[PDB]
Amino acid sequence: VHLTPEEKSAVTALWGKVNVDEVGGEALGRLLVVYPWTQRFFESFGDLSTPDAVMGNPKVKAHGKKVLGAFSDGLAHLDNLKGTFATLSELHCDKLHVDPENFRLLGNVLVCVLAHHFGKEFTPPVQAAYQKVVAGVANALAHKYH
């Protein structure tokens, strides 16, 4: 995607402060709470029946960390998100059967989580930059669907 260098540096700076494991578990958990139909993909995971059960579920935390880890790795290749995520794009289509609309929902939940975590540091311009990135990542992950 195309970021101005001041958007790029906004995204980079904030991300050096993110505990990926913790933010990842939060983001995934919140997705499954706020948009519960997304639980469709995780019935192997245990008890997802109340907010407290989802947030404390260890398989949610583990997977949350896996997903934001791969997400991290794409921040390192912001100039070619499609090529970075082609393999995972094909996996989520052909093996996992995940509607790419779910990528958009998680992008927006992640922005919520960053705002909740960083408070007033997550200013409108920083949000704008992150919104372009998560749209980019969602797009990159949906690119090999057929």
Binding site: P36, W37, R40, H97, V98, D99, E101, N102, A142
Partner: protein, 141 residues
């Protein structure tokens, strides 16, 4: 909200659809899978080749539910209650996909009902399919 004139329009058009309802239901599904491939992620267990029995069968089921809602247009919440529970608790289709199937059903109707698909009826049918979509997504959260 469907106005009474909307209800008259939907009844008249669907009346014309009559007995082709199931064939039209299958064609709208096939239109959807080709135009919007992401929707195929909800049918990984179907043979989605053209004319498959699974698609024809599902087309008829879709069409009967629509026929039930036109019959009970004044009471669609009660009429579709079973189907809203099924989509909210079991199938869990993301709401965005209801818009895509609605578009393809409108396209199918337009292609088959040259005389009845006037601007006003198009408007009424789009609004009807939006209300069905809203009732089927009602209980999602």
């Amino acid at each position: 909200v469907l106005s009474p004139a909307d209800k008259t329009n939907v009844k008249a058009a669907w009346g014309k659809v009559g007995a082709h309802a199931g064939e039209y239901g299958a064609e709208a599904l096939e239109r959807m899978f080709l135009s919007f491939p992401t929707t195929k992620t909800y049918f990984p267990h179907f043979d989605l080749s053209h004319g498959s029995a699974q698609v024809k069968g599902h087309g008829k089921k879709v069409a009967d539910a629509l026929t039930n809602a036109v019959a009970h247009v004044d009471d669609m919440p009660n009429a579709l209650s079973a189907l809203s529970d099924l989509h909210a608790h079991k199938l869990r289709v993301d709401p965005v996909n209801f818009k895509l199937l609605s578009h393809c059903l409108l396209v199918t109707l337009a292609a088959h009902l040259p005389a009845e698909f006037t601007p006003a009826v198009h408007a009424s049918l789009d609004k009807f399919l939006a209300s069905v979509s809203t009732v089927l997504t009602s209980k999602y959260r």
